[PDB]
Symmetry: none
Subunit: 282 residues, 6 copies
């Protein structure tokens, strides 16, 4: 069950206290990178949310944003500190006697800190519900990372069927070609004995690609095994494609017929198509 690095998932929780929205987005990356945007009230929640994200995700760049819109009507009714307000008025009266002018503004006294305050302090209860909501949107994020990736797995397996069908097309042509190479050489040597076949068969071992086709088939069987294991295989699959293309290039190099060369090109096209999908794999 392979997963992809790029996915999106947003969840919004509505309550009397307020509305909070968790958004998670991700893009392909070489290593895991985490970025968190949180409100000031839930800034203390940043270490807790980072451990959950990092434990669940092995690789990829993920940005998580939480936006809290509290309800001011559900906010507790404001209390007026009468002693502090009188303490500020008598202080301003002293300033007015020094300046011999000025007028106290009532709104400014209310704006002074501690004069009008709210003591709801319900943040701890809603934070536990936000943490439970974070696990829900993180599961929606993981299920989206696992939804796609099954499609990527099918695309790679479809190309893996194309490379194995392409080597059997080379396997049938090759013995016919090996005999043809001896014939054209003999006609050229018209102007030129025993043990000439001894040098021919050693040259034919350099032309033969059976050992290389065997390795390529072994790499395909391994690639099927790599897709089934449940771990990070994004980079391992990329290293495997370098060996796929290594055998394709040495096959196109030792190719002496145009039919085999066209098959080697088809192999390299399928490898490029697989490498494009492996980039999206974690």
């Amino acid at each position: 069950m392979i997963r992809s690095m790029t996915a999106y998932a947003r969840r919004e929780i509505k309550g009397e206290w307020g509305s909070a929205t968790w958004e998670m987005r991700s893009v392909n990356q070489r290593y895991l990178e985490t970025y968190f945007r949180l409100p000031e009230q839930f800034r203390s929640l940043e270490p807790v949310v980072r451990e959950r994200i990092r434990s669940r995700l092995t690789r990829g760049k993920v940005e998580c944003t939480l936006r809290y819109e509290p309800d001011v009507s559900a906010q507790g009714e404001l209390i007026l500190n009468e002693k502090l307000a009188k303490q500020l008025v008598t202080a301003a009266n002293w300033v007015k006697m020094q300046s011999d002018e000025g007028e106290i503004n009532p709104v400014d006294i209310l704006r002074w800190p501690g004069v009008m305050a709210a003591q709801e302090q319900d943040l701890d209860a809603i934070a536990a519900e936000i943490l439970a909501a974070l696990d829900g949107t993180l599961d929606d994020f993981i299920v989206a990372r696992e939804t796609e990736g099954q499609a990527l797995k099918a695309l790679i397996e479809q190309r893996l069927e194309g490379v194995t069908a392409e080597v059997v097309k080379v396997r049938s042509h090759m013995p016919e070609i090996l005999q043809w190479q001896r014939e054209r050489l003999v006609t050229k040597l018209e102007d030129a004995n025993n043990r000439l076949e001894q040098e021919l068969v050693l040259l034919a071992q350099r032309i033969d690609v059976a050992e290389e086709l065997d390795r390529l088939e072994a790499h395909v069987k391994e690639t099927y095994n790599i897709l089934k294991k449940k771990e990070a295989v994004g980079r391992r699959l990329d290293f495997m494609m370098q060996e796929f293309n290594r055998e394709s290039n040495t096959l196109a190099s030792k190719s002496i017929n145009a039919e085999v060369t066209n098959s080697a090109i088809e192999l390299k096209v399928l490898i490029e198509q697989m490498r494009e999908q492996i980039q999206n794999i974690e």
Copy 2:
């Protein structure tokens, strides 16, 4: 039918609610890279945008930008908390009694946090219209790719004709090639123990026949509906292989000059293929 990797297309939809613009540009790239610049309100549309673009475009580095301009009257309405405003006015009246002076500033009451708030309009009907404009931008984008791709197809076909013209030109010197072919073989016999005269490959007719089939295959590749950019690049490497083998053989001035011209045509074709998806 082949599509160039670089193209540009913009579409703007105007309505009473506001105006939005879909700008989309692309450049050449080995694999498909999708970068989206979307407003915070339409940030949720990003997975839907990626689904539509990735399905339609096989390869290339594409950047898509969306900019939304809301009408100043639309998506705009003030919500005034009447109870909280009355609470602040009565609290300020109490302060005015202790101070025996002062005047309540109205805008200061509005700037109090809980007093003023803005309502959230339903962007669902707009988002569906913004999403439909993206489909139209993709249609204008792929046709601009096909228009530039047809010019690249003509340049490659024009130089494929010069490749075949050079292959026929060396086959006029074919009788001289056979003379030089046998003469090289007998001179090595004259020089004569690890005598691998068999290992020497001097045949050039197979190289020309093998190269001539690649040209016929290249025309067939250009007719394909799927992406052909990477396949043509691999094909040029085989064009270069047969030119490199023909390059090693020094026969006469006309043959060597034709081999030089062949490699120039391949490089000119390979430069245009980098622009092909």
Copy 3:
């Protein structure tokens, strides 16, 4: 010793003056960058906090914040009468230049320092705050040292897996060489061609040299032994480990290129996976 460049540590100190909790976190960054979020009362403490943090922390992007809430302590406040008179006389000079204006009393009280809390002394709170800061920093260093030791165990776990893949390849190597020469003679027996004297031996020597990977395997084992030595000596560990990974990777690529067996190729891929896993942890090293 080695220290993990990313770590977290917070501490809360409660007192009669109020409650203040120091919280500092770090992420892996190529340079030292300290961002502080301090209250207005402790805004003057910004320079001394920066010097103390940067003296013990050599590298990394650190975000340190302090949350402070004043305690009413059940309402009387002190008034800086001299500072208020200083501002009124300074405003009177401005009024004579402008020839207009009125001094707002609340605006004078809004000036910093004009109003102060009687229940608390700012200098006494700052001394407790500064003493709490170095306590968080000392625990912050330990949080880096413990997680740094965790990164060391990860690299050693992958190093022993690297040296296990090398001896796994060298066990297959003699069998592979004999399989290649036996594959050659079987085709000569099928072809019934007359065998020549020492022509076979010279071809066997040539292929043996092409498949020979002895220098790459010995060079890989020298790299793992050097990596343990670099990991033991705790001087410039973060930089010197980066160079070893490039040497590990080019020997693995050279091995994968010169390989003729699919099983050896699979082992070379495993090496490159282990190298990539080691590189991921080396970035976290300070």
Copy 4:
């Protein structure tokens, strides 16, 4: 071509929107590090700038700063939301009826968010101009590296000439020293003792000549300067290959100073070790 890892490049473009300045500074470093300091508006351009620089530059430590100056007066005329302003005034009128007093400040209405908003100028045309100025700065930067590399090569070749001058300075002085050492031995021996079998004298003179002989290290120093000039001629892996020669240069100079029986030869060996250190200063700057 050899290129110095220390250079400075600057490029300024003038436009109606303002002026943009690029600055490049490079310091020697074993790895390739690139640090970028861009404005908040063009912070999205960093991954595009990083690709062009990392692809065109070899190893080193590079710092990039982009300074963007807005004209302010020439562009960005403020637009007034008349509908929102009237909405706030009617809302404030309601509060005025409740309080039965107050006065609406006009500038307070303008300072309300969204009332007076400047139209955002599309930075697409300006960012393309900045990207075009970047590759022009990289061109000046590469040229500066190549011109400084030629200066480092001249300094290395200048010291190499001083190395050969010291080697032949020792070679001419060596036979004079070997004759004086023979003349001293026979004089000390004849002063207090008799000649010993004649052939024993020749044996001791041969042993003495072998101990003071430095011709092997002296010939090996001259072989090192010829390979060093060839290495400078080669433009492939010049930095890694040139470090090895300095250790070999310093190896032969140390063994030469150890076998130096004459003070003028020892001073020449020290001058060699000074020239080697001066060459080592330039090689850490090259690739």
Copy 5:
């Protein structure tokens, strides 16, 4: 009065202006390397503080850090920038001419940045107080060096006592040693009269064990004399241990007696143990 290179000392001075703290720590080094961490206000003190550390210390790697913590006080008078205030009033007059109305608030002009500037603190009186605290820290740093240095001196003298004790153990075998020395000479006289070469004169120079023990006992009495010196003797004692090993190399190389060989090995173990402690002596 020998001193160890590793030592630590701190001092804090308190005043109404604030509090400052010096902190010195050192480790072993071949030469003297000093590193200073100073506040930006007292950066100018770096050349002065270096000369003082340099005067009382000869070798070692010290790191000297200074923490300056001024008390947070708004008591400092704020200068009224009369120039800038007049610049703002004339600018506001222009706005009044355009609007044809308005009034300049004096408090708002004061709130404008730069109009009220805090008086620069003359730290000359504080710097002299901080420099005086450095002298106290250096004095505490030196006594910490001398305290640890006395323990090293006692440990070296204990090892020197074992050296002389092992010498006496070999001195008893001296009549047996002189027999073995004479046996080496007569053994080299083999096939005596075909090569005209006499290694006997050379061998008499190489096996002068009696002079080694005498010269070794002279090095011990000199080592005691070196410990009583006032100047730093760290490098001198290390050079002395090289000579201790030279006199004991012949005893370990030649097996005159199994008991003598054991005593020679213990003799070289003591030299290595003294070498380890001399690393810590300045």
Copy 6:
């Protein structure tokens, strides 16, 4: 005129445009490393300051910081008149909707962008900054030469001790060479080894010429005379002196190895001590 690598120099200048301070400090380094902390207005001066410093400094790690404090326009502030008119016209529109209000002038000035960037003649100021850099750079070298003269006196004081130890060994050497003739022949008589008569006497003095340290003392005295000559060079001689001390230490080790007398061994140790003391002063020499 030798110069120490560690030095400090700080200069402060005042003008109508403002006040700026150059600060230069340096420490020991193998080669020359220059780092610059410059304001944003004078970041363009960095390539000019670098060539100026590198011209007069041969090696060392030097940090060069410049603090520039701008002064408000003394003897008028530039004001965006069109933006201010646009805000007054917009406020007038609000005043007719509300039918009340008064435009506060300071509130218009507080608006972002109304106060344009203040006029500064950066070209005329930078020329004064460059002239102050030269003064600080010349003031920096005076601090180098002052400390260097102290290092020169310490080295010359130890060089006098070297020649004093050399002549002490020189005087005792002819006596000790005679003592070995009588010492070696006595050991031969103890074992009753037959004398070779004249041939023994010849080999004895040939061996004595091998033990004779007079050749090492002559070379060492020539190195002392050369070290005085090196101290008079105007160029940097920090590295050359270090290479010279290696030859000092080479002859001393050869002296201690060939030593046969405890007093000569103690004198060789005194030589090695003086050489280490000179090396400690030399490590600070440019």
